[PDB]
Design a protein around this ligand. Structure first.
Ligand SMILES: CC(C)(O)CNc1ncc(-c2ccnc(Nc3ccncc3)n2)c(CC2CC2)n1
Ligand code: NA
Length: 526
């Protein structure tokens, strides 16, 4: 009946009532070939009663196997049954590394829901999350790299060390188990350990270099010259000439070192560094090296933006997004991929507007407002894409210093210090959209505006379809040391859930999205 289809449609986090539980339970045998009924059914099971547990796992066997997207729910805190947890890993094994990599950050966090004793006893349908992740890491260099940096930061975490010494020791063990597996492997596998160790030394030497620059009082010019001098002496610092190691930030990129003479410090409180990595093929890879600050909140947000971009691209909707790489190398430092762009604040300061800026660096006679057709389409798509993504992620503290623009027309957001409905000012707008963006398209009477609205609807409807995956991924982050999560862990997933408005139809959703843009665009006139 229809009452069953309304119950299975529920978000992964929607808590079923006792009345709703005993209903799914009664009709369990009639739901066995319904893929999206299994999670709802496993919720209903009295995992304490042996006869119920027994019949439930019998049903788990004969049940239509679930999607990887839905399987992520089985790895959360709500599940403790070892069979249900091995089943979750068994479905997760069906995913390819490309997908697995998209979920890895949350999978490292999901280890704190695993059996700590099994992880320990492994030192010196049958695989747990630890064995599975190490297994996959041994076969894929990229995966091994992120499993290393994700676990090392959780080991380093001093807040976990004191608050949960049990979880801290579990991660030390995950690292020991990983190191053990690497040494028991093939020629290819055994060299991954020395590669991870070489990058760890590299980062340690870079951390020391940043400190060597700050030991003094000096002009930014003098500090820049102190950075350049220290990077130049490869005999002492060994940072300008290294055996081609993976770049922790993007391991597919193999680096020779940092170019000494082009390295500088940013005009910013913690003076992060701009460093150019010499890649194996003579190319340059610019990075931001941030010290004395925690990148984990940005690292999560950029990981979700990347996922959202891949999902949209999958549905043949490339909205020209900039999911720049963010990697924390400690709870105190890390890397960000430097993107050549200009903050919108500076766009207004130097050129007066986004339109002027575009007319200057990308003109064309009969193009929209004398601007390149390609640059304008890129701008409309990226605006729409970010308007929707920042709306869902509840990104606050939006100002024109953390809104960046490229000369190719790419608009994007940076610095995700405020997320999930948090903002320095009270009553913040739900739709993160300003008059500078709107004026960039050519105002509300422009064909570009209608196109922007259209792209906002398309993105929303496609992202709404992946609500199960996104909410499951957030549910694995509830107990992570992410400031804006740690504030209200118990309320985190619902904050994301409510933005999808999964209560509304596709037609109803586009009207709500349509009204939200209007209510925001008319609020810009007060
Ligand atoms: C580091 C922080 C004080 O915590 C703020 N957070 C943050 N987050 C991301 C970026 C970033 C990321 C990627 N590309 C660029 N490019 C550009 C291109 C041109 N002018 C600016 C940025 N900037 C940045 C900006 C760099 C530090 C100056 N800051
Ligand atoms: Na990008």
């Amino acid at each position: 009946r229809d009452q069953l289809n309304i119950i299975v449609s529920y978000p992964p986090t929607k808590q079923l009532t006792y009345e709703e539980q005993d209903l799914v339970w009664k009709f369990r045998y009639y739901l066995t070939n319904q893929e999206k009924a299994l999670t709802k059914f496993l919720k209903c099971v009295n995992w304490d009663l042996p006869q119920e547990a027994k019949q439930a796992l019998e049903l788990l066997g004969k049940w239509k196997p679930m999607d990887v997207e839905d399987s992520l729910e089985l790895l959360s805190s709500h599940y403790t049954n070892p069979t249900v947890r091995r089943y979750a890993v068994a479905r997760l094994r069906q995913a390819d590394d490309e997908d697995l990599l998209m979920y890895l950050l949350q999978l490292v966090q999901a280890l704190k829901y695993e059996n700590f004793d099994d992880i320990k006893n492994g030192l010196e349908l049958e695989q747990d999350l630890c064995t599975f992740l190490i297994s996959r890491a041994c076969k894929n260099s990229t995966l091994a790299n992120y499993l290393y940096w994700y676990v090392i930061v959780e080991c380093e975490d001093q807040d976990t060390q004191q608050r949960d010494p049990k979880t801290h020791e579990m991660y030390l063990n995950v690292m020991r188990r990983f190191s053990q597996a690497l040494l028991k492997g093939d020629k290819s596998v055994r060299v991954m350990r020395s590669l991870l160790a070489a990058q760890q030394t590299f980062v340690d030497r870079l951390v020391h270099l940043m400190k060597a620059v700050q030991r003094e009082s000096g002009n930014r010019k003098k500090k820049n010259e102190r950075l350049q001098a220290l990077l130049g002496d490869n005999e002492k610092m060994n940072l300008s000439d290294v055996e081609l190691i993976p770049l922790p930030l993007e391991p597919q990129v193999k680096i020779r070192g940092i170019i000494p003479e082009t390295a500088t410090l940013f005009k910013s409180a913690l003076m992060p560094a701009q460093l150019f990595f010499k890649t194996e093929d003579g190319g340059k890879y610019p990075v931001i090296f941030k010290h004395g600050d925690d990148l984990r909140q940005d690292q999560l947000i950029l990981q979700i933006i990347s996922l959202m971009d891949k999902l949209l691209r999958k549905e043949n909707l490339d909205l020209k997004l900039t999911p720049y790489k963010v990697l924390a190398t400690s709870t105190k430092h890390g890397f960000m991929q430097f993107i050549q762009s200009v903050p919108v604040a500076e766009v207004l300061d130097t050129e007066g507007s986004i339109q002027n800026f575009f007319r200057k660096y990308a003109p064309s006679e009969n193009g929209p407002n004398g601007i390149s057709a390609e640059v304008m389409d890129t701008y409309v798509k990226s605006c729409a894409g970010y308007c929707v993504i920042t709306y869902i992620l509840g990104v606050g503290d939006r100002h024109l210093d953390n809104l960046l623009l490229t000369k190719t027309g790419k608009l994007f957001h940076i610095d995700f210090g405020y997320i999930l409905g948090r903002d320095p000012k009270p009553l913040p707008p739900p739709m993160k959209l300003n008059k500078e963006m709107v004026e960039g398209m050519g105002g509300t009477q422009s064909e570009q505006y209608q196109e922007f609205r259209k792209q906002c609807y398309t993105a929303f409807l496609h992202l709404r379809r992946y609500s199960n995956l996104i909410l499951n991924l957030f549910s694995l982050m509830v107990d992570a040391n992410i400031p804006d999560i740690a504030l209200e862990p118990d309320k985190t997933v619902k904050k994301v859930q409510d933005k999808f408005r999964l209560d509304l139809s596709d037609e109803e959703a586009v009207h709500y999205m349509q009204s939200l843009i209007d209510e925001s665009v008319h609020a810009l006139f007060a």
